[PDB]
């Protein structure tokens with residue numbers, strides 16, 4: 001199939017700086033045009049207001065990163081390139097929330113522009129259910145020339161580290177194609 005990264009049974013906690021480093025996998029992510037990032041995780045129950053699930057970030061450019069995050073329980077998403085400009089529409093007020101202290105999944109899909117999808121297509125799903133589609137761009141890691149780091153949890157942006165929380169992660173899976181809504185429903 002299309003599985004390029006699979007990480008199972010890991011966690012963010014005090015002893016690892018609330019972070020699982022996956023930066024060894026950066027080149028795999030840079031190569032992707034259509035992609036899926038899927039994470040099944042359990043946040044500690046009284047979560048921070050903003051925390052990162054999966055991010056790619058840069059040691060030299062503080063405002064160039066990709067993040068699938070949770071903001072006041074809302075599953076959210078943001079990508080910014082080397083000019084700091086937004087790749088996607090705002091997801092901070094997307095409709096679907098996770099429940100902390102319980103198992104949840106969040107799935108992002110990205111489809112590069114095509115003749116019929118002229119600006120590409122991005123989707124975020126929460127527990128198998130489409131939360132919001134964004135048709136601003138189909139930009140992703142290939143569009144971020146200065147990235148250096150990949151992580152679950154606390155995210156290094158230049159000389160600062162932010163968005164840490166304690167998470168149990170049953171799996172992180174990255175695919176080299178965009179799963180369909182039907183596939184997200186069954187494969188989560």
Ligand SMILES: CC(=O)N[C@H]1[C@H]([C@H](O)[C@H](O)CO)O[C@@](O[C@H]2[C@@H](O)[C@@H](CO)O[C@@H](O[C@H]3[C@H](O)[C@@H](O)[C@@H](O)O[C@@H]3CO)[C@@H]2O)(C(=O)O)C[C@@H]1O
Pocket residue numbers: 050063069071076077078092162
């Ligand atoms: C998806 C999203 O909301 N991204 C925005 C983020 C996050 O809201 C934030 O990192 C979550 O904590 O915020 C961004 O803007 C931050 C940035 O401008 C820095 C500059 O130092 O300031 C942050 O606010 C500070 C505040 O100024 C501090 O004095 C103190 O109050 O804490 C906060 C830290 O949140 C901005 O939130 C970002 O780049 O991180 C803009 C993103 O679009």
